Nucleic acid binder design. Structure first.
Ligand SMILES: [Zn+2]
Lengths: 342, 83, 718, 302, 26, 237, 63, 226
RNA sequence: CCAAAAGAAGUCUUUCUUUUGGUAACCAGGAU
């Protein structure tokens, strides 16, 4: 959720259009968004189209315009020179597709390949006019939409919901990494920042539920403190537990302690459940679901929720607010849990 | 194509009740006023006698006055006049 | 009529009622003791509560409450958990799926508030839609699949009937449906195999009852021999006892027909019990129908590549012609679009012809449970042409199915239209509600006040215009314009006696009789012509679409009309300068000038047309000869109207003939043709949109609104 | 005081004080913060979801004995409906289910005499996997349908040499409630499902009577105070359409802001009498006073 | 893949990407 | 380990041979544990007698109609199929029904040997006309459950004999439902409702008693492994 | 003026109603809802709201 | 056609915690029903014993950490939730666990009183280091089914008590298959082969016996109809 | 309508009397 929040592009603010005064031509997906703003991940409510997310490879240039890397092909030879083009330059040239048949020598198998022409037009140009190619597929998607396996078998309507509902998942008491992922989980977990990563390589000296002490190759030592059962902005648990032992050697940039929804450094938002795809007696009728009682006995889908309560003592013109056990009109049975000073 | 034993709040059947009155709007007030009379009878039973009489049909162990009113309307033990 | 209420919610709603019974039963000395008991939840509060909540209705409501059936009354019962349990057969009325919806619970207190929730608002008393009269408590989805599976006859199945071979007698004949249920339990018989049974408790069909029993009928107990499957006997055991034997496969249409027949000919309690039994059987047999989805069940057309190559050559030739300058940009796009539409159709046909009849996907589609075949083509064979952000087709087109997986560009150009579709809904959800709010206010003072104004005015109904060679072809939209009406005049044909008397409900049998007698137009009563001072009468309004009988003398027909018009919004897609959807309806009811205004004629005669430059110029030649009407600034971007041939010079026009192609403004037609003509215009125009979206609204609701639109007059001379 | 509908252990206490020269907002002497923690299990009405937009609340939680179980006695954990998949065009969940079964069981492509054609362009060291193997299918370059089919055809037995899921990807299940086997094979596999932050325990609320507002005497709103559910304009249109005048009159007078009606009806209920007749709502009198404050002579005639 | 202690998650990818995913908080 | 609340068993007699038994309250969920077992035992574990095969004079090759009789062969077969008979001899005994002259043949016209009895003597079977004669032999033996028609083991032994399906079970139809009960903070316990319909050779209470006895023996087979094994005990009646 | 003021353009409706010194007869559904009175529709009209219920004489005798 | 050969039960021992029982000759159709009735009774209604609560000395609630222990209290409780223990007396009993210094802590470090016994001494609980010191007492009790944690307030307990969910089920996995012989001469029968696997707390024979006792009681309920 | 204190009666813990004490508007984020 936080990583998705930090990579967000909202068209509404002081100096931008308004949710109640936005038409349908600004909520559309212009063909210039390819590689720069994800067409899937957007809110489903009355904010649909007014809030988007930055794609994986995009960067913002000094003037505030978004760019995407392209792999330039010189005389039919797909090079490895990456050049970042903004939408106008991408407009001038002709761009091929990433999943094209390269022949192990930077040469297309056939002459005819799908491309993108000036106004986003898709055509079949002989493979001699092609100027650029995408650095990869998964260049038009954002981080959250790149974690859906078999995304091209799902229609865009349901993929939007699948991407938007992954940032509403709650951390569970014990985390489990998916059996079938996409390879984006590790990068998204290490870049979000909820894990502890070894700053310098060395050997682990002490481990505990509260800290890890690393002994660096040159004299120095570093102790990493852990966040145990800490509340997040939305009232969930924020545990951190080590995944190294007292003798292991760690390297720079290595994950040294898990986080809320990580399983050994990879994002782990849910659990792997054995499923059947049958209708059963009308209890899974109209989008309803049937669960085994094992998932309750064995605490598979259990979560911890933490609450925060605040009070303060203030002077006031009359003066002297006090925190104390001596409260008027209160009995002792309702003053049993309180300690000696409130 | 007779029906089965009507269950709970669905007894007595509404068609037979509507056979007694002009519309269902009349039935609503019919039953409501009879239920009020039954409740007043129960409240005044220990106290001094008053005109309100009933129930005319044997009630159950714990039966709400609206159910008794509806079951009396069905047995044709009451009469009503409109405004 | 029941709902599941979590017991901690029930104990809180019914707190005062439990506190009284706790004292009354001597479980508490006074009310403070009973209140402490209820707050601490001692074990006897539950025994008191289950007695307290018995036969006490509770009102359930889901927001937005678009129509009347958004609130209904149920009988609560305690359940374990924190979620309200809702009956599966009320979700169409509530429009409530189980992906996270919530509902609010209210509790009537007085005697009138409790009688109105049992005699008026009870769920089982409201089975029919008040907008059109169609049942809303029908089986759907899993129940339809289960009932379709059960009543299906598989040729050459286990235990089938076998004629005598000369060495052994007939096989597959059973002495009762209890001997067949015992053979199905041994694996010797299939529930979908044709058999012969000796039925005694099921009424035979009309022909078999006539040709075997004569006299009066079967008179339960008399035995007849049926040739059917076991599943059909089981299905017919769920229907009433006096209902004939339905020997058919239960497509959703057949179920709708049966439930309409039962609702017409039987009381409400019978229909409610029947639909409950059908629900039970449908779920039970949908669990056993074997409907699952695996990618081995998603077959692909065997020769997709040949078709796609064949049409690729056509597209290549068109592209080459464009590259040679034979045609401009738009002509090439149109040619390619036609080619690819043909290719998509030719792929879909092969897909349709390749699938078996017992595949789960086509089974779910063909039983009527849910989904259409375009979604099956898009998933198995080919997606096809997709639109631009502007709306024009991309001429590529998308050539992969979702089983094969789209490439990156195909996925992008598909998202183009996907997001347009999502934004459309997101923005119409509010316009529907605003329109409903305005319609409720305009017509909040139309209430049935009298029983009969005893007027003689009325409207006429098309009612199956005559065929050219000579025949009565019924008018397709007769259920929303002629049914549930009372006649104003008498129906007499060919000097024959009055076929139908004045003041008759004019249902199905009467319409059939009128069509057999050979008349085409009847003058019926309408609210547009009611003579009462304040509010409509009952006979002019006619049958009540929900009750099925004549409307009452207190019903608020205006609010019902507004909720019926404005509830099916949302499911009213805006359509790609003439408006064609919810904006069209809004400008019709707001009596605005249409966006694409098209002038109408003012007087008969021939018309002289000068095809000027940058705008047409039409002038009407008056047969009377007084003055000529001139229409000067008419853009050449419009089209000329075609009635019966495009408008031709010198052609004769009627008094109110529409010249250009578009939407005439309602104000001019009122000034020219009078109030009846504008009433016809408005009702027809609104019904046209709603029909185009496949929504059935009876005409009397639009007539209520239009009646409210024409109450006043303007003062010209004081 | 801990507000309505909350509980749990006290896990932490953070107390600030001016005596320790802590930086506090001006005019504040002390500040104390208390943390309360709950552990919530999954229950009916909680919202679950997959990665392909297949959401839905939990309808039932069955005991482990009445669930469809495989031939070896393994019950299924979750049951999804068939009618939702083909109509929504999210067939990716079925392919995820198949590949999840293959990954759970582990496979071995038999290259006894030449690699199979479907496994020609399959990367090396994918020709065999151990049980509970973790794999990855990138978003637009992953596992083809032919490769999934081939992997399904070759998948390891569990403990004894029994293959529970056939080449189509379906299994023969037993009805744990009746006992008989289901007549046709069913699709089984492993799906990765998520628990969404839309739990019932935050959604359930009820009220008999409680706090009321000040300017207008109507009940408050929200669970943390107590508040009542709102009976809006549309719900009033619905009740007018039904024709129920008494229900509508009581809902708007003796349940909202008839200040004497509330106490009288409560007394009548607890004492078993008849519910009295409503009076005049207080919001109407507030409206009259505001209209008079705008210098308008509003008067009620008789 | 390029993290010193990442788990071994075998991929079905047929293509090879020249460019690594940038820093996602850049 | 005690059960807490002991279940009961009550009957609701609907017809002379048709009942409705309710067992309540059961732990969540023993309704499904024993409802299907009881249904199966009632339907397939009570001994009875039925007609196994018949030979009818004049019908050897053509099985469409019988000379001199109004009803065709299959109607006679499925009239004799629904015949209530009780027998004690284990071996298949032979009965003869024979009647000359026009009239209505009835189940009472059969002459049963020693041991066999007919419990619906007034059952219509056939009608004769024009000085017709009917002579059909019945073979009656006692079995269990429902056995389909058994094809000839030795064709040469009999040419006229034709097998028929045998409904041995005295119980004809059984159905069951499970519900929910209890005000005791649970609302989760079960209520099993049986619906037993029998012939007139037994009553729905005797059939249920016999089914209970059979199930008791069957599960006592499993009990005798370890006699001093801790289970759930409901307590004395 | 009460119904129109509650529908839309409250300020304009109120100012012109004040200038015309309009009097409201309270005959509609919305106006009776606002002031807390029984709506003149369905069960709230005089034909049904003033029904009189009485036991039959035979029923009185039988008791 | 009255077959008068009663069924008979025989056991085949695959291993200590597994075995197969064969019941034959059953009537045609009564194999699945019998097998499923036995499976349903086995998987729900067999009594056992489980830990009901713990008390770590240095901790006050479940959401804290023990100095020196690599796991936190929640993980320690989730690890102890995999104990298999068998008691012999109705009243609750307490078992102690004491550990000092570095080294892994297994289920063999628990000192059980008379009657109770731990059947998996190799189970991992927690790992300590030189600062580690773990002292916890487990309350063992008998019952059946699954029981959620008893609130600390319901019983009279201090702040240091940690109620724990209890799972008193010895049976682990059950399945069956039927071998139906359908000959042309219509002498048929079934053959139930029932497979039972327990978690080393009791043998499969002792679980099947308990199921038999329960079912015999519940069907004698219906037998005594007259 | 609730809390606290005092007095009286009985029960071993309820009743009677006296005194004191007793919310909104904005902005934001979600769901159907
Ligand atoms: Zn009229």
């Amino acid at each position: 959720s936080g990583l998705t929040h930090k990579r967000r592009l909202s068209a509404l603010g002081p100096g931008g259009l308004s949710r109640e005064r936005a038409g349908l031509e600004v909520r559309d997906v212009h063909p210039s968004h390819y590689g720069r703003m994800c067409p899937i991940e957007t809110p489903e409510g009355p904010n649909i189209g007014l809030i988007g997310s930055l794609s994986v490879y995009a960067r913002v240039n000094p003037f505030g315009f978004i760019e995407t890397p392209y792999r330039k092909v010189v005389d039919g030879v797909v090079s490895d020179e990456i050049v970042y083009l903004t939408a106008d330059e991408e407009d001038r040239h002709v761009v091929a597709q990433a999943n094209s048949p390269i022949d192990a020598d930077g040469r297309f198998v056939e002459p005819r390949v799908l491309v993108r022409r000036k106004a986003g037009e898709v055509e079949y140009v002989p493979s001699s006019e092609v100027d650029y190619m995408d650095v990869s597929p998964r260049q038009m998607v954002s981080v959250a939409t790149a974690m859906i396996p078999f995304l091209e078998h799902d229609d865009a309507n349901r993929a939007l919901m699948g991407a938007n509902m992954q940032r509403q998942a709650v951390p569970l008491v014990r985390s489990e990494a998916p059996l079938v992922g996409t390879g984006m989980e590790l990068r998204a977990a290490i870049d979000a920042g909820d894990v502890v990563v070894a700053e310098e390589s060395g050997v682990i000296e002490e481990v505990s539920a509260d800290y890890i002490t690393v002994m660096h190759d040159n004299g120095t030592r570093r102790t990493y403190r852990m966040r145990k059962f800490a509340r997040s902005n939305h009232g969930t648990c924020a545990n951190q537990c080590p995944i190294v032992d007292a003798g292991d050697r760690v390297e720079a940039g290595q994950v040294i302690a898990d986080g809320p929804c990580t399983d050994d450094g990879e994002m782990a938002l849910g659990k792997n459940l054995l499923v059947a795809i049958m209708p059963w007696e009308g209890h899974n009728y109209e989008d309803a679901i049937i669960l085994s009682n094992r998932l309750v006995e064995e605490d598979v889908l259990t979560s911890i929720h933490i609450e925060e309560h605040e009070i303060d003592a203030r002077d006031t013109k009359l003066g002297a607010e006090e925190i104390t056990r001596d409260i008027p009109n209160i009995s002792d049975e309702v003053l049993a849990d309180l300690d000696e000073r409130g | 194509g007779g029906y089965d034993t009507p269950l709970g709040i669905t007894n007595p059947p509404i068609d037979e009740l509507l056979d007694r009155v002009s519309s269902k709007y009349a039935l609503v007030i019919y039953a409501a006023k009879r239920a009020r009379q039954i409740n007043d009878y129960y409240n005044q039973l220990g106290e001094g006698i008053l005109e309100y009489v009933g129930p005319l049909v044997e009630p159950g162990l714990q039966e709400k006055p609206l159910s008794i009113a509806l079951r009396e309307i069905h047995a044709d033990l009451l009469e009503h006049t409109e405004g | 009529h029941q709902c599941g209420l979590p017991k901690l919610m029930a104990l809180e709603l019914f707190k005062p009622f439990v506190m009284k019974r706790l004292v009354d039963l001597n479980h508490a000395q006074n009310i403070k003791s009973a209140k402490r008991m209820v707050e601490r939840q001692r074990p006897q509060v539950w025994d008191v509560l289950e007695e307290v909540i018995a036969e006490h209705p509770v009102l359930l409501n889901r927001a937005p409450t678009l129509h009347r059936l958004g609130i209904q009354a149920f009988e609560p019962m305690l359940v374990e958990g924190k979620a309200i349990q809702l009956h599966p057969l009320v979700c169409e009325a509530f429009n409530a799926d189980f992906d996270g919806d919530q509902m609010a619970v209210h509790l009537p207190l007085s005697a009138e508030a409790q009688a109105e929730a049992r005699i008026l608002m009870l769920s089982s008393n409201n089975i029919l839609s008040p907008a059109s009269g169609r049942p809303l408590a029908m089986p759907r989805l899993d129940m339809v699949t289960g009932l379709y599976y059960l009543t299906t006859e598989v040729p050459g199945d286990t235990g089938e009937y076998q004629p005598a071979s000369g060495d052994h007698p007939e096989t597959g004949v059973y002495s009762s449906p209890a001997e067949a249920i015992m053979a199905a339990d041994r694996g010797v018989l299939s529930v979908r195999a044709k058999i012969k049974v000796r039925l005694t408790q099921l009424r035979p069909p009309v022909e078999i009852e006539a040709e075997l029993f004569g006299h009066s009928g079967w008179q339960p107990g008399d035995a007849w021999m049926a040739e059917t499957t076991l599943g059909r006997v089981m299905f017919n055991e769920l229907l009433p006892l006096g209902y004939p034997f339905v020997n058919k496969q239960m497509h959703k249409k057949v179920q709708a027909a049966i439930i309409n027949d039962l609702a017409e000919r039987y009381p409400m309690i019978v229909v409610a019990q029947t639909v409950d039994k059908l629900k039970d059987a449908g779920f039970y047999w949908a669990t056993r129908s074997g409907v699952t989805v695996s990618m081995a069940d998603v077959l692909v057309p065997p020769r997709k590549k040949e078709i796609l190559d064949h049409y690729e050559e056509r597209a290549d030739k068109v592209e080459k012609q464009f590259q040679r300058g034979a045609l401009n940009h738009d002509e090439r796009n149109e040619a390619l679009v036609e080619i690819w539409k043909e290719a998509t159709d030719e792929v879909g046909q092969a897909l349709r012809e390749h699938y078996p009849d017992d595949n789960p996907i086509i089974t779910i589609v063909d039983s009527g449970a849910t989904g259409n075949f375009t979604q099956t083509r898009t998933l198995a064979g080919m997606k096809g042409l997709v639109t631009n952000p502007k709306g024009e087709f991309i001429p590529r087109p998308v050539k992969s199915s979702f089983r094969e997986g789209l490439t990156v560009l195909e996925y992008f150009i598909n998202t183009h239209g996907a997001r347009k579709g999502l934004a459309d809904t997101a923005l119409r959800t509010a316009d529907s509600g605003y329109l409903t709010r305005r319609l409720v206010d305009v017509s909040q003072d139309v209430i049935v006040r009298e029983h009969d104004c005893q007027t003689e005015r009325g409207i006429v109904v098309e009612l199956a215009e005559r065929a050219p060679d000579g025949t009565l072809i019924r008018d397709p939209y007769i259920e929303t314009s002629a049914y549930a009406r009372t006649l104003g005049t008498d129906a007499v044909d060919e000097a024959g006696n009055v076929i139908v008397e004045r003041g008759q409900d004019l249902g199905d049998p009467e319409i059939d009789a009128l069509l057999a007698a050979g008349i085409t137009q009847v003058k019926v009563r309408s609210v547009l012509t009611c003579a009462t001072s304040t509010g409509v009468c009952a006979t002019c309004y006619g049958r009540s679409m929900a009750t099925g009988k004549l409307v009452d003398i207190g019903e608020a027909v205006g609010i019902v009309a507004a909720q019926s018009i404005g509830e099916p919004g949302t499911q009213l897609t805006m359509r790609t300068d003439i408006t064609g959807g919810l904006p069209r309806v809004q400008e019709l009811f707001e009596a605005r000038v249409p966006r694409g205004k098209a002038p109408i004629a003012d007087v008969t005669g021939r018309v002289r047309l000068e095809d000027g430059e940058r705008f047409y110029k039409i002038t009407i030649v008056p047969d009377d000869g007084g003055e000529e009407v001139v229409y000067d600034k008419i853009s050449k971007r419009q089209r000329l109207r075609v009635f019966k041939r495009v408008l031709s010079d010198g052609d004769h026009v009627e008094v109110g003939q529409q010249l250009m192609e578009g939407s005439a403004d309602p104000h001019e037609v009122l000034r020219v043709q009078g109030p009846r003509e504008v009433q016809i215009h408005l009702v027809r125009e609104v019904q046209e949109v709603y029909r185009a979206q496949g929504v059935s609204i009876h005409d009397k609701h639009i007539e209520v609104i239009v009646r409210q639109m024409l109450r006043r007059v303007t003062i010209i001379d004081s | 005081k801990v507000p309505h509908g909350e509980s749990g252990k006290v896990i932490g206490i953070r107390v600030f004080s001016r005596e320790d020269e802590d930086e506090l907002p001006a005019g504040v002497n002390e500040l104390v913060r208390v943390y309360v923690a709950q552990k919530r299990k999954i229950s009916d009405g909680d919202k679950l979801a997959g990665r392909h937009g297949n959401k839905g609340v939990i309808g039932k939680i069955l005991p482990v004995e009445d669930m469809p179980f495989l031939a070896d006695g393994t019950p299924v954990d979750i049951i999804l409906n068939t009618h939702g998949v083909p109509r929504r065009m999210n067939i990716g969940q079925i392919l995820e289910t198949h590949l999840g079964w293959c990954a759970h069981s582990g496979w071995k492509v038999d290259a006894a005499k030449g690699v199979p054609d479907w496994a020609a362009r399959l990367p090396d060291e994918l020709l065999e996997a151990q049980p509970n193997a973790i794999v990855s299918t990138p978003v637009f370059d992953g596992a083809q349908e032919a490769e999934l089919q081939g992997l399904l055809s070759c998948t390891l037995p569990n403990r004894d040499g029994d293959v529970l899921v056939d080449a189509d990807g379906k299994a023969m299940l037993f009805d744990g409630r009746s006992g008989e086997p289901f007549p046709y094979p069913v699709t089984v596999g492993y799906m990765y499902i998520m628990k969404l932050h839309h739990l019932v325990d935050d959604k359930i609320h009820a009220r008999s009577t409680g706090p009321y507002s000040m300017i207008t005497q109507q009940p408050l709103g929200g669970k943390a105070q107590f508040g009542g559910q709102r009976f809006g304009e549309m719900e009033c249109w619905a009740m007018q359409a039904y024709g129920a005048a008494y229900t509508l009159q009581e809902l708007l007078t003796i349940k909202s802001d008839d200040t004497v009606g509330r106490v009288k009806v409560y007394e009548a209920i607890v004492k078993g009498e008849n519910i009295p007749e409503p009076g005049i709502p207080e919001s109407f009198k507030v409206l009259l006073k505001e209209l008079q404050s705008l210098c308008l002579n509003v008067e009620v005639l008789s | 893949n390029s993290v010193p202690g990442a788990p071994n998650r075998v991929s079905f990818a047929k293509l090879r990407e020249p460019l690594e995913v940038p820093g996602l908080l850049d | 380990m005690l059960i807490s609340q002991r279940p009961t068993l009550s009957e609701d007699v609907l017809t002379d041979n048709r009942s409705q038994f309710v067992i309540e309250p059961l732990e969540p969920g023993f309704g499904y544990t024993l409802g299907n077992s009881l249904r199966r035992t009632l339907l397939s574990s009570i001994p009875g007698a039925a007609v196994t095969s018949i030979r009818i004079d004049g019908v050897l090759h053509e099985f469409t109609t019988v000379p001199g009789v109004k009803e065709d062969v299959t109607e006679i077969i499925l009239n004799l199929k629904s015949l209530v008979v009780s027998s004690e001899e284990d071996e298949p005994v032979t009965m003869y029904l024979r009647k000359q002259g026009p009239g209505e043949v009835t189940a009472g016209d059969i002459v049963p040997p020693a041991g066999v009895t007919v419990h619906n003597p007034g059952m219509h079977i056939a009608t004769l006309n024009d000085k017709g004669k009917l002579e059909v032999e019945l073979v009656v033996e006692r079995g269990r459950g429902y056995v389909p028609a058994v094809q000839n083991r030795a064709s040469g032994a009999e040419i006229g004999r034709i097998p028929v399906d045998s409904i041995y079970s005295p119980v004809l139809k059984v159905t069951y439902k499970v519900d929910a009960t209890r005000v005791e903070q649970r609302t989760d316990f079960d209520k099993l409702i049986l619906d037993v319909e029998t012939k007139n050779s037994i009553s729905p209470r005797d059939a249920l008693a016999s089914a209970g006895k059979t199930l008791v023996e069957l599960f006592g087979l499993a009990r005798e492994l370890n006699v001093e094994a801790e289970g759930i005990e409901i307590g004395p009646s | 003026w009460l119904s129109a003021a509650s529908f839309q353009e409250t300020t304009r409706v109120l100012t012109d109603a004040a200038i015309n010194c309009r009097s409201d007869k309270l005959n509609g559904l919305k106006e009776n809802v606002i002031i807390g009175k029984l709506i003149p529709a369905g069960t709230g009209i005089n034909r049904y709201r003033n029904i009189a219920v009485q036991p039959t004489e035979e029923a009185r005798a039988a008791a």
